[PDB]
Homo-oligomer: A and B are copies of this chain.
């Protein structure tokens, strides 16, 4: 939410991850943590970050398993302190509903990943993305993830989910997406490498904020 900028913290060691996150904390209040960091440092890193930085944590786990396993993944993730989890919609409605049920039980949120931002997304996901977004609307999903790299697709996604839904978007910077154009449709942009690989992460974050 702060500055409509979410940091994707994909460094793989705790010391560097804490250093960069602390350096840019005055610019953000929401950090997306994924498997690169969690599989290297453990799930306890989520609660550590949440406490140390007083930020919201979105666990980007691209959840994509059967219902029963998705439920277990969501339970472990919320137990670890995550405020929200990103779930793929392409595995179908039952898999998404399993995640929504756990989020309801635990007072948390599910973000539905519709279309991905990388080139390969055009092979199979893009053709199913509008229907995946419609499925989300039908299931009551209120939070979505769409691609910064294809603003016309981000626009179509926004059209399907409505103005009240919350939409975040990765692919800004390194993948080629533009901050300002992405924010014409998304509520917040996700930025990873453009900030965490910069010589001065704080200056990189400040520059993105200045550009928007």
Q: Using a CB–CB distance below 8 Å, which chain A residues touch chain B?
A: 1, 29, 47, 54, 56, 78-82, 104-108
Please give me the 8 A-B residue pairs with the lowest Cβ-Cβ distance, nearest first. Answer: A81-B107, A1-B54, A79-B107, A78-B107, A80-B107, A106-B106, A79-B105, A79-B106
Considering the complex, give the chain B residue whose CB is closest to the CB of A106: B106
Copies in the complex: 2
Considering the complex, give the chain B residue whose CB is closest to the CB of A107: B81
Provide the residues of chain B in CB contact with A78, threshold 8 Å: 106-107
CA A183 – CA B47 in complex, angstroms? 25
A-B contact pairs, 17 of them (CB 8 A): A1-B54, A29-B29, A29-B54, A47-B107, A54-B56, A78-B106, A78-B107, A79-B104, A79-B105, A79-B106, A79-B107, A80-B107, A81-B107, A81-B108, A82-B107, A106-B106, A106-B107
Name the distance in Å between A82's Cβ and chain B's nearest Cβ: 7
Provide the residues of chain B in CB contact with A106, threshold 8 Å: 78-79, 106-107
Name the distance in Å between A74's Cβ and chain B's nearest Cβ: 11
Provide the residues of chain B in CB contact with A47, threshold 8 Å: 107
Provide the residues of chain B in CB contact with A80, threshold 8 Å: 107
Name the distance in Å between A22's Cβ and chain B's nearest Cβ: 14
CA A207 – CA B56 in complex, angstroms? 28
Name the distance in Å between A187's Cβ and chain B's nearest Cβ: 11
Name the distance in Å between A13's Cβ and chain B's nearest Cβ: 23
CA A199 – CA B107 in complex, angstroms? 34
Q: Which of A56, A79, A106 has the most CB of B within 10 A?
A: A106
Name the distance in Å between A59's Cβ and chain B's nearest Cβ: 11
Provide the residues of chain B in CB contact with A105, threshold 8 Å: 79
Provide the residues of chain B in CB contact with A79, threshold 8 Å: 104-107
> Apart from A79-B104, A81-B108, what 10 extra A-B contacts exist at CB < 8 Å?
A1-B54, A29-B29, A29-B54, A78-B107, A79-B105, A79-B106, A79-B107, A82-B107, A106-B106, A106-B107
